[PDB]
Amino acid sequence: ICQDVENLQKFVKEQKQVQEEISRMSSKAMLKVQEDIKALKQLLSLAANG
Amino acid sequence: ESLINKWSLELEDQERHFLQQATQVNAWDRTLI
Amino acid sequence: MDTEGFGELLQQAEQLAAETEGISELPHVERNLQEIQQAGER
Amino acid sequence: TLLGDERDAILAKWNQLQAFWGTGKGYFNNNIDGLVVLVFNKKETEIRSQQQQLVESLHKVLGGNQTLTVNVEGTKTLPDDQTEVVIYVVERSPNGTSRRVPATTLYAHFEQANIKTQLQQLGVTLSMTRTPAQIKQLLQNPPAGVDPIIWEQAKVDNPDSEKLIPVPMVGFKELLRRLKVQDQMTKQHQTRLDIISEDISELQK
């Protein structure tokens, strides 16, 4: 049994690591995009009006 | 029962979080399409 | 943001007011604000 | 003891197997991949060496017209001489619309005798495929070990059915997964946006 808790907390925690891992990983790259396509669309309107 | 307690609350705590994050990604994917 | 429309517009309007030989279309003078509002009203 | 089952439930909770999966359950909606895996007799190596050729090579097996493009997802090492290359092909249409060729009518093409022979000359020992109506085809009949009543409900719950189908998502690394794709995805968006941007600059210039 107390082999036991040595492992389970270990597999659980191993998992929290991945949770951290995702947490480390987070977006600005994404936020960037809408701004750009919103911007490119506008230049296209230029060229078109030109 | 010191320990088991620790398990659940950690569990629900992270779960409540994981939930919110998945959602993030959903909303990000969201924005992608 | 990166826009290029009103830079076209201004462009146009810039390109508008200067000349040329075109038998008719001579450049126009630009008003603005006080005289223009009234001009709009007329 | 009541005590042991709670332990079990908790252990159950934190797991990829899916017995009330740690209440990790979340479904993400994936729009509706064309992936074919190839085994080369070659070192991982013979592959990253000449990666250009190697898809060209693949390109011309396909016929080598422009409306056709070969893409490489990962290359992994299996043994001392040995490699797995996963690829998908996108096909362009008369109006300039792109999509990936489906895995099966790609696999059908490669299983050909000539093409197989040609692929073999390339070093390919083996190949495998992962997989209108076809949506209907996969979305029902359930997936990965996902419960049939939940899977149903993601189908009703689906906010945006053509752009999307329910795709099973599996705890944290899966979200990791999704993110990796998102990034994958991000770069290509950025780029295509650049291509539009370049063409617009050329027109304006």
UniProtKB/Swiss-Prot annotation, chain A:
O-glycosylated. Residues 6-26 form a coiled coil. It is found in: Nucleus, Nuclear pore complex; Nucleus membrane. It comes from the Eukaryota. Contains FG repeats. FG repeats are interaction sites for karyopherins (importins, exportins) and form probably an affinity gradient, guiding the transport proteins unidirectionally with their cargo through the NPC. FG repeat regions are highly flexible and lack ordered secondary structure. The overall conservation of FG repeats regarding exact sequence, spacing, and repeat unit length is limited. Component of the p62 complex, a complex at least composed of NUP62, NUP54, and NUP58. Interacts with NUTF2. Interacts with SRP1-alpha and Importin p97 proteins when they are together, but not with SRP1-alpha protein alone. Component of the nuclear pore complex, a complex required for the trafficking across the nuclear membrane. Belongs to the NUP58 family. In rat, the p62 complex contains two different isoforms of NUP58. Isoform p45 has however not been isolated in human so far. This is Nucleoporin p58/p45. It comes from Homo sapiens.
Curated annotation (Swiss-Prot), chain B:
It is linked to Infantile striatonigral degeneration: Neurological disorder characterized by symmetrical degeneration of the caudate nucleus, putamen, and occasionally the globus pallidus, with little involvement of the rest of the brain. The clinical features include developmental regression, choreoathetosis, dystonia, spasticity, dysphagia, failure to thrive, nystagmus, optic atrophy, and intellectual disability. The chain holds residues 334 to 366 of 522 of the full protein. Signal peptide: none annotated. It comes from the Eukaryota. It is found in: Nucleus, Nuclear pore complex; Cytoplasm, Cytoskeleton, Spindle pole; Nucleus envelope; Cytoplasm, Cytoskeleton, Microtubule organizing center, Centrosome. This is Nuclear pore glycoprotein p62. The lineage of its organism: Eukaryota, Metazoa, Chordata, Craniata, Vertebrata. O-glycosylated. Contains about 10 N-acetylglucosamine side chain sites predicted for the entire protein, among which only one in the C-terminal. The inner channel of the NPC has a different redox environment from the cytoplasm and allows the formation of interchain disulfide bonds between some nucleoporins, the significant increase of these linkages upon oxidative stress reduces the permeability of the NPC. It comes from Homo sapiens. Belongs to the nucleoporin NSP1/NUP62 family. Contains FG repeats.
UniProtKB/Swiss-Prot annotation, chain C:
Plays a role in the nuclear pore complex (NPC) assembly and/or maintenance. May anchor nucleoporins, but not NUP153 and TPR, to the NPC. During renal development, regulates podocyte migration and proliferation through SMAD4 signaling. This is Nuclear pore complex protein Nup93. Belongs to the nucleoporin interacting component (NIC) family. It is found in: Nucleus membrane; Nucleus, Nuclear pore complex; Nucleus envelope. It comes from the Eukaryota. Part of the nuclear pore complex (NPC). Component of the p62 complex, a complex composed of NUP62 and NUP54. Forms a complex with NUP35, NUP155, NUP205 and lamin B; the interaction with NUP35 is direct. Does not interact with TPR. Interacts with SMAD4 and IPO7; translocates SMAD4 to the nucleus through the NPC upon BMP7 stimulation resulting in activation of SMAD4 signaling. (Microbial infection) Interacts with SARS-CoV translation inhibitor nsp1; this interaction may disrupt nuclear pore function. The chain holds residues 1 to 42 of 819 of the full protein.
Swiss-Prot record, chain D:
It is found in: Nucleus, Nuclear pore complex; Nucleus membrane. O-glycosylated. It comes from the Eukaryota. Component of the nuclear pore complex, a complex required for the trafficking across the nuclear membrane. Contains FG repeats. Component of the p62 complex, a complex composed of NUP62, NUP54, and the isoform p58 and isoform p45 of NUP58. Interacts with NUTF2. It is linked to Dystonia 37, early-onset, with striatal lesions: A form of dystonia, a disorder defined by the presence of sustained involuntary muscle contraction, often leading to abnormal postures. DYT37 is an autosomal recessive form characterized by the onset of progressive dystonia, dysphagia, and choreoathetosis in the first months or years of life. Affected individuals show delayed motor development and may have impaired intellectual development. Belongs to the NUP54 family. This is Nucleoporin p54. It comes from Homo sapiens (Human). The chain holds residues 128 to 363 of 507 of the full protein.
